[PDB]
Structure formats: C-alpha cells, structure tokens
Ligand binder design. Structure first.
Ligand SMILES: O=c1[nH]c(=O)n(C2CC2)c2nc(Cc3nc4ccccc4[nH]3)n(Cc3ccccc3)c12
Ligand SMILES: [Fe+3]
Length: 285
C-alpha cells in the first residue's frame, strides 16, 4: 500500500534527518572534518519554524566561494537562461551575493518565500529520492550549508552550499520554475518506488542538468551545470549530445555523477516542461 509521506511542511522534520570518505579532498583535514560535523549538526537539530542558523564563514571558506563565484559569473551572461540572469542580480541586492560574502540560508529562504513561497531547509547530507523530492511538494528545497574544501575550489564530489546558492536558488525565485519543481514533489508523494525513480530522473535532467531553447539559442538552467565551470562550458560547446526533453524517454536515462553527462535534455520552456510532466505523471500514478 501507500508508503508514509509528509502531509504538511513540518512533517519534513520526520524525514529530513534520515541521511566523509577517504577519496574526498579534505578527508585528510582535521579542521575541515570538525567543520563538516558542525554543519551537519546544525541541520540535524533544525526543526521547521526555526530561523536557519546564521553561520560565520571563515576567510578560507569565503575565498573558495569567491573563486568559484568570480569564474562562474564570467560565463552566466552567455550561458545561463534568461530567468537565471534576471534573478541573480536581485539576490546580489537582497541576499549579499558578493565575491567577498557567502549569503546566509536564512536570508535566501526569506527572499524566496516572498518571491515564490519557496523556502530553504538545511540538510545534513544525502536523503533518499523520496524524502528529498517530498520537500518540493511544500516548496521546500533541502539545501547543504557547508563549503567545498579550499584545496580544489573547482571540483566538489557533492552538492555544497556554493552549488545550492549559485546553481539552484536563482531559478527557485522564478514562479514558473517553482511551479514545475513543486509539481515534481507533489507527483512523488506516496508514489511507487518505480515512479519516484522516474520522477527523480526527470528532476535530474531538468532541475540539475537541464538545457532550454530561448530565442533559437540553447541556454542552461540546470543547477549542476550552473555551478560547474567545466561542464557549463562543455554543455553549450557543441561537442555534447543533446535530445528533446521527453519524460517517458528521459526517465530511462542514467544519472552520471563522477563525470560529465552523456546527454543533456532541452526543454522548450519551464511551462512546457511542466505540461509534459503533467501528461507523464498520469501514466505513473
Ligand atoms: O539528498 C538528495 N537525495 C536525492 O535523492 N537526490 C536526487 C535528486 C533526487 C538529491 N539531489 C540532491 C541535490 C543535488 N544536486 C546535484 C548536482 C550535481 C550532482 C548531484 C546533485 N544532487 N540532493 C541533496 C544532496 C545533499 C547532500 C548530498 C547529496 C545530495 C539529493
Ligand atoms: Fe543540485
């Protein structure tokens, strides 16, 4: 029968806590060790209704952010979709997006709440697909608060806060994107294991690695691209395989992690991607 799923936004307290390795940069770092523990604990003890704890980031952490931030910002005008470019300066103004400042999740959450009703919840680590997607049903983005190791600013084995803030947040501020995202979460609620994996894959090739066509040009809206200097350039380089976004086809595609994607999917628009998902979710309900 139907598995447990959240019925209200505070119900995410019951799944968001259901979560390093030696190959990771920073395994070797005792200070980074304690820091990550500190971030994980903040997420574990967060309960819905709490202000998200404000963090004093270290100078090393801010420098790492600045390095990623600076290089990525050179590429956004020519690579990011128009919605991304529209919202990014608003975040600069209202949430302190600067090369020399890491935005606080609480500010970003308040900004999004007034823009689309989206909000942030710090998450200690990787959640099951089901739990992660369930947050979106209440317009809750489960969001990492830690920073990648300073040794390698340009690669992270995992979503860190830099990826969340530069990759995800600007589009969550966009009504059409937020509707699309929430509908993925809503479709997942209490769905079968198979449906959840299918929805997770569609989410992956849209929210995380999606491309869209705007005024005849391919642009990027996927968060994983927008926080990855290499793959951002590669995705629009012309040497990449591209297919039309089509849920029944896209949900079969394998989600690669330790490498560039084999293929990227192109949505006509967020509205259209939304309409296709709606048609698709009917066949998996
Ligand atoms: O917890 C998740 N569970 C899941 O099942 N999915 C998949 C989509 C259903 C997730 N996805 C993302 C965010 C995310 N952003 C990424 C960017 C590039 C590669 C992987 C990414 N995962 N997270 C958050 C997260 C937080 C800490 C460590 C790993 C992942 C999850
Ligand atoms: Fe992500």
């Amino acid at each position: 029968s139907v598995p447990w799923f959240p019925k209200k936004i505070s119900d995410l307290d019951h799944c968001a806590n259901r979560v390093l390795d030696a190959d990771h940069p920073g395994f070797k770092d005792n200070v980074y060790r304690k820091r990550r523990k500190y971030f994980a604990d903040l997420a574990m003890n967060y309960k819905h209704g709490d202000p998200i704890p404000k963090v004093e980031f270290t100078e090393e952490e801010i420098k790492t952010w600045g390095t990623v931030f600076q290089e990525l910002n050179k590429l956004y005008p020519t690579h990011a979709c128009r919605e991304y470019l529209k919202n990014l300066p608003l975040l600069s103004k209202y949430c302190g997006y600067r090369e020399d400042n890491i935005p606080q999740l609480e500010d970003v959450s308040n900004f999004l709440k007034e823009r689309t009703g989206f909000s942030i919840r710090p998450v200690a680590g990787y959640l099951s697909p089901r739990d992660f997607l369930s947050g979106l049903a209440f317009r809750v983005f489960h969001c990492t608060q830690y920073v990648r190791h300073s040794s390698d600013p340009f690669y992270t084995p995992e979503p860190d806060t830099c990826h969340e803030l530069l990759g995800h947040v600007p589009l969550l501020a966009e009504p059409s994107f937020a509707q699309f995202s929430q509908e993925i979460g809503l479709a997942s609620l209490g769905a079968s294991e198979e449906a959840v994996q299918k929805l997770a894959t569609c989410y992956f090739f849209t929210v995380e690695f999606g491309l869209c066509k705007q005024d005849g040009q391919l642009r990027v809206f996927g968060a994983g691209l927008l926080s990855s200097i290499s793959e951002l350039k590669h995705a629009l380089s012309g040497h990449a395989k591209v297919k039309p976004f089509d849920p029944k086809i896209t949900c079969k595609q394998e989600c690669l992690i330790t490498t560039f994607q084999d293929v990227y999917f192109v949505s006509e628009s967020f509205e259209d991607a939304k309409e296709k998902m709606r048609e698709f979710t009917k066949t998996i309900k």
